[PDB]
Amino acid sequence: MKLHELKPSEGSRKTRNRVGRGIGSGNGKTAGKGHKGQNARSGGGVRPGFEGGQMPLFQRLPKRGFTNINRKEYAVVNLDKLNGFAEGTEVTPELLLETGVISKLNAGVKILGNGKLEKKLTVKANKFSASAKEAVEAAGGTAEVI
Amino acid sequence: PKMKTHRGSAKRFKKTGSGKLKRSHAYTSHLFANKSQKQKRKLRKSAVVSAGDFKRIKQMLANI
Amino acid sequence: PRVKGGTVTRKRRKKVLKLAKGYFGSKHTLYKVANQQVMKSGNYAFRDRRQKKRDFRKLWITRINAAARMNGLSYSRLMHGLKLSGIEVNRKMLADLAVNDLTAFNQLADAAKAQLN
Amino acid sequence: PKVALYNQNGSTAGDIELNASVFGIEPNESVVFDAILMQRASLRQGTHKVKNRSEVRGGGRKPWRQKGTGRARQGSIRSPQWRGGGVVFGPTPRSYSYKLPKKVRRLAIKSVLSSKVIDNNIIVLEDLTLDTAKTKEMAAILKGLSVEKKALIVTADANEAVALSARNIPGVTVVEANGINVLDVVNHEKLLITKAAVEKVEEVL
RNA sequence: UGUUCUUCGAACAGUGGUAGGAGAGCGUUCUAAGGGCUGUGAAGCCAGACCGGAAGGACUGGUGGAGCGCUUAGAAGUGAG
RNA sequence: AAUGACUUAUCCUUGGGAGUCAGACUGCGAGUGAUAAGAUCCGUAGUCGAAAGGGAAACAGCCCAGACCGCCAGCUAAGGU
RNA sequence: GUGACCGAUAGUGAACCAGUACCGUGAGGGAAAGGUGAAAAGCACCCCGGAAGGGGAGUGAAAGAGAUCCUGAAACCGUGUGCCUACAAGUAGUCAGAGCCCGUUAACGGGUGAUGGCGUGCCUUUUGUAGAAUGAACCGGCGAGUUACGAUCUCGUGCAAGGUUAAGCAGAAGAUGCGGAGCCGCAGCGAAAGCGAGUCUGAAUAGGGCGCAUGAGUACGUGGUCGUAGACCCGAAACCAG
RNA sequence: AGGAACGAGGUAGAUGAAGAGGUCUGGAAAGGCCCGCCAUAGGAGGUAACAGCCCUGUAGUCAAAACUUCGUUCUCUCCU
């Protein structure tokens, strides 16, 4: 690219809005904040969770616990993701992690029955759905729990 | 620094699948003799946070 | 980097003061009254560019009234005669120059006389 | 790309076929523009600092009381409207560094190499044979290839005779094969690259 | 400025405005690219009856005695009643 | 509120950014007040706010009429000769 | 050794006999103030004057360069000149306009203007201000929407159901190359166990809520906005510690 | 828990290329035009006006009587 004309992409850059730099531009004296309010003052303004002294929305609603200490996230493999192997043998989470289908192992791998498969696969995982197991067994594949 | 998450709104509300956060109803913990059964079967169900409330509280729960 | 900005301000002030040349006293000398006088002169210039179009017309109406009243008619009867004696759209300051070129105004006045009766 | 070879004597008979994956793609103008703006940033130091209202050497007292005198309030000795300075925001020391995603970086370097290829500004010199450390020989080499403006010298193995020479010529910058970048390619508008450097940057990038 | 036709473009309609929202621009300092003015006189200052829709910009004459401008970009200690 | 027309070009949903929580007068319809207030509080339409111009002598709100700019062009509104 | 850091109201308070002068009993507070010329070659000599200070004559490229000394603006003070002013009630202008005096970036020319018409400054705050409501004696300089880290939206670029690496190691403290540790999305529902293109409530193969069905995010860059930051500048009375 | 020598630094320095090029305007060329060189040296500051080849200089080749800062060897000391 030629250096003494560096033309930017159209729409990628925009001029910063000057605020309080004369009355002809707009955002003049009052600088876009109106006349003589709290919102026109320096430093705010109120909290985001504040209704002017009305009891706020979260404080009118009850708590809904709880959070489990040891929760496993067996997620996620769908049936259409298994079609990327041509033709594919020994579907392993150790193989699925380095293939790029699974970004991160979270305590196991569960294969779910959304979509469909058309090939013979030897499938190894931690858990299976009821529809996914039947879809593997209908194609002649083998599903085994680690 | 990182944006702090409003822990109270994290305890009340719950993110849904875009969302339209899930919430519970009020008037569901006290004085059930003065309320009818038709009120109680509807207040024990869940509700959705309204849009005028959503435009004010969605910044408080950005980090989920 | 640091921006000083020394010359463009003085350029603005001298442009305003040269626009305010000829004013009385401190209004051609001090910037802060010269700017107010220039803005007020701009409003006055717009207003008087509107007003010249009608006070010239009223002066010409006065002169046509005087010239018609020399010939025995008023202004309103003369204009009614000009609209009746054909559709003649002869404008009023050309009618005022017609008395600088007398007796051309008298012939149009007689044309107004002819079909008012 | 049909690029003619040069052997700095004839020069020369024969040519080398560079690959179209690097030197033959269509140039992306916005990507090279973003790479130039990214590279021009973080070369600057950002070592600019002014004293804020709290950091000026001044007392905390007020020069006169709040009411009673016919003057302004003026709670600080050196408020920003005073002569003592003066700045609320000012310049602050900060880093201008940011990173483009890696595919944009490879696309930028390949597109600027292809745009230099289609402008016929690439000169290929095999092994860059230089007998002595004198810069007179390098100037004669640059004269023999009709180079009068700025130029790059890309060397794969980073020879010391090439490196110590041509650094006194103001328009000539000798760079390693993996040390290539967007700014030196867009800045000099002509590059002298060896066959070993091409056979390195083809598999590096 | 908006709509339609789109046969250089034409037709029709619109164009007071505070708070506010949106868009297009003019200037200041520094930096990157080339290119170019300068003691046969730069910046600055002073005057003029010049040009542009505006912020603004040029050209002459005097003072001055050494730096400045143009371009496409990019950053801001970015324009004062 | 419905389906048959003629005019217009507005109307909902989502998302980004606001300002406004002191209003005033006039005409009509009510309350309080003494069917007093340039009083107070309401409903409704206009004007001002945020609207220049012409008329009410001056006089935000009344009457007539909405200023992109230029013309030393014409015809009219309120009101007048 | 380097600055998309400052250039004398800036930058250290302090570019200069500066923590000095000065103020306060004391703790303490705390200024202003750079520039002849390349070289003093810093005006020999004559005249006025007591001197200071001038006019000649010299040095000098420049003496209007002559000791706060480069350039030198405006407020302010003066001297001349062209045109109007001693019957006139004026936010001082504007439009029309004769006379008189000059010639320009030659352009329906410039300056002054007897006289007529219209016309109660600017800003702030207000329902409403010419306001007898506020602010400004005048001029010059300085003087208020910035920056760091996150979040959201629009636009642009790259790759696309896969995008991106942080720290760190090499490497002009630069680009980049290695680094997939981690982050977001790729379908969710439920308080949770759990189940899954469904899940929860519910005896329910009923109804209903949420979601695919009917399908795009990710990483950077600009811009708008929001949080944590003095957060848009200035301003209290006060509180606490030594 | 004590010392002696070899190598590299600091506290201080030396050496270190190339033009009076010619003409023009200038008070003075470091400026314009026409010309040649050096470069491991075109970092900078001055020189009567914008130096690379005018000076101090810079890159490299080096030095250390006397103080130290490290690294190596030896002496020495300790050990089932």
Swiss-Prot record, chain A:
Entry's Gene Ontology cellular component terms: cytosolic large ribosomal subunit
Family matches, as InterPro entries: Ribosomal_uL15, Ribosomal_uL15/eL18, Ribosomal_uL15/eL18_sf, Ribosomal_uL15_bac-type, Ribosomal_uL15_CS
SUPFAM superfamilies associated with the record: Ribosomal proteins L15p and L18e (SSF52080)
Positions of region (Disordered): 1-57
One Pfam family it belongs to: Ribosomal_L27A
GO molecular function, one term: structural constituent of ribosome
Composition skew (Basic and acidic residues), residue ranges: 1-13
Keyword line: Ribonucleoprotein, Ribosomal protein, RNA-binding, rRNA-binding
Keyword set includes Transcription: no
One GO process term, biological-process aspect: translation
Bias-annotated ranges (Gly residues): 21-31, 42-52
Keyword Ribosomal protein recorded: yes
HAMAP family attached to this UniProt entry: Ribosomal_uL15 (MF_01341)
Purpose: Binds to the 23S rRNA.
Assigned protein family: Belongs to the universal ribosomal protein uL15 family.
Subunit structure: Part of the 50S ribosomal subunit.
Protein name (Swiss-Prot/TrEMBL): Large ribosomal subunit protein uL15
Organism: Bacillus subtilis (strain 168)
Gene (UniProt): rplO
From Swiss-Prot, chain B:
Keywords: Ribonucleoprotein, Ribosomal protein
Subunit description: Part of the 50S ribosomal subunit.
Gene Ontology terms: cellular component: cytosolic large ribosomal subunit
Pfam families: Ribosomal_L35p (PF01632)
Domain of life according to the entry: Bacteria
InterPro entries listed in its UniProt record: Ribosomal_bL35, Ribosomal_bL35-like, Ribosomal_bL35_CS, Ribosomal_bL35_sf
Record flagged with keyword Ribonucleoprotein: yes
Entry GO MF terms: structural constituent of ribosome
Biological process terms in GO annotation: translation
Source species of the chain: Bacillus subtilis (strain 168)
Protein name per its UniProtKB record: Large ribosomal subunit protein bL35
PANTHER family, per database record: 54S RIBOSOMAL PROTEIN BL35M (PTHR33343), LARGE RIBOSOMAL SUBUNIT PROTEIN BL35M (PTHR33343:SF1)
Region (Disordered): 1-47
Entry similarity comment: Belongs to the bacterial ribosomal protein bL35 family.
Extent of Basic residues compositional bias: 1-25
Swiss-Prot record, chain C:
Pfam families assigned: Ribosomal_L20
Database matches in InterPro entries: Ribosomal_bL20, RIBOSOMAL_L20_CS, Ribosomal_protein_bL20_C
GO MF annotation, one: structural constituent of ribosome
Keyword Ribonucleoprotein: yes
GO BP, one annotated term: ribosomal large subunit assembly
Subunit annotation: Part of the 50S ribosomal subunit.
NCBIfam families according to UniProt: rplT_bact
Function in brief: Binds directly to 23S ribosomal RNA and is necessary for the in vitro assembly process of the 50S ribosomal subunit. It is not involved in the protein synthesizing functions of that subunit.
Protein name per Swiss-Prot or TrEMBL: Large ribosomal subunit protein bL20
The organism of origin for this protein: Bacillus subtilis (strain 168)
Gene: rplT
Swiss-Prot record, chain D:
InterPro entries, per the entry: Ribosomal_uL4, Ribosomal_uL4-like, Ribosomal_uL4_dom_sf
One Pfam family hit: Ribosomal_L4
GO process terms (BP): translation
Extent of Basic residues compositional bias: 59-70
Cellular component terms (Gene Ontology): ribonucleoprotein complex; ribosome
GO MF terms held by the record: rRNA binding; structural constituent of ribosome
Region (Disordered), start-end ranges: 47-84
Keyword Nucleotide-binding: no
UniProt keyword terms in alphabetical order: Ribonucleoprotein, Ribosomal protein, RNA-binding, rRNA-binding
Keyword Ribosomal protein: yes
Assembly: Part of the 50S ribosomal subunit.
Function: One of the primary rRNA binding proteins, this protein initially binds near the 5'-end of the 23S rRNA. It is important during the early stages of 50S assembly. It makes multiple contacts with different domains of the 23S rRNA in the assembled 50S subunit and ribosome. Forms part of the polypeptide exit tunnel.
Protein family (similarity comment): Belongs to the universal ribosomal protein uL4 family.
Protein name, UniProt field: Large ribosomal subunit protein uL4
Organism ancestry: Bacteria, Bacillati, Bacillota, Bacilli, Bacillales
